[PDB]
Curated annotation (Swiss-Prot):
UniProt similarity note: Belongs to the BET family.
Source organism of the structure: Homo sapiens (Human)
Domain Bromo: 1-107
Cross-link (Glycyl lysine isopeptide (Lys-Gly) (interchain with G-Cter in SUMO2)): 106
Domain notes: The Bromo domains specifically recognize and bind acetylated histones. The NET domain recognizes and binds the 'KIKL' motif found in chromatin proteins.
Location in or out of the cell: Nucleus; Chromosome
Domain of life (superkingdom): Eukaryota
Name this protein carries in UniProt: Bromodomain-containing protein 3
UniProt note on tissues of expression: Ubiquitous.
The protein's role, per its UniProt record: Chromatin reader that recognizes and binds acetylated histones, thereby controlling gene expression and remodeling chromatin structures. Recruits transcription factors and coactivators to target gene sites, and activates RNA polymerase II machinery for transcriptional elongation. In vitro, binds acetylated lysine residues on the N-terminus of histone H2A, H2B, H3 and H4.
Quaternary structure and interacting proteins, as annotated: Interacts (via bromo domain 1) with GATA1 acetylated at 'Lys-312' and 'Lys-315'. Interacts (via bromo domain 1) with GATA2 acetylated on lysine residues. Interacts (via NET domain) with CHD4 (via KIKL motif). Interacts (via NET domain) with SMARCA4 (via KIKL motif). Interacts (via NET domain) with NSD3 (via KIKL motif).
Disease linked to the protein: A chromosomal aberration involving BRD3 is found in a rare, aggressive, and lethal carcinoma arising in midline organs of young people. Translocation t(15;9)(q14;q34) with NUTM1 which produces a BRD3-NUTM1 fusion protein.
Signal peptide location: none
Amino acid sequence: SEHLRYCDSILREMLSKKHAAYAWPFYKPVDAEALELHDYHDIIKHPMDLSTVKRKMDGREYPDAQGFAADVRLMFSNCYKYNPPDHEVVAMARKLQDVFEMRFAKMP
Ligand SMILES: CC(=O)OC[C@]12CC[C@H]3[C@@H](C[C@H]4O[C@]45CCCC(=O)[C@]35C)[C@]1(O)CC[C@@]2(O)[C@@](C)(O)[C@@H]1CC(C)=C(C)C(=O)O1
Ligand SMILES: [Cl-]
């Protein structure tokens, strides 16, 4: 759709070097074992990351832009749910979500 191509562009920007500094914790799925997070899958029941979003976007799996946003926001919400609000990862999550929400609001 028209809206989904703009979403594709948002995805490109989120994956670019421009934001890598704060975006990198969301590039690949959360490896709970490598990160020794023994409670991750108790708290987060629907994991989500940027690569999964690329898969769903490249496989034409989103019905419309609103499903795209649902998955992106879900990713962010999971980060906020799991960490306490003074962790730096939450600040990075907020920076990146600022980018996403800005670009999404400015959708033509
Ligand atoms: C990949 C990794 O190093 O993980 C470690 C860590 C995230 C990043 C944090 C790091 C703590 C501080 O060392 C800082 C120093 C400053 C900034 C910083 O980035 C890190 C490396 C962690 O905070 C500890 C555990 C934790 O895994 C989580 C819980 O925050 C998960 C990690 C992930 C990927 C998600 C999506 C989440 O919800 O949160
Ligand atoms: Cl909305």
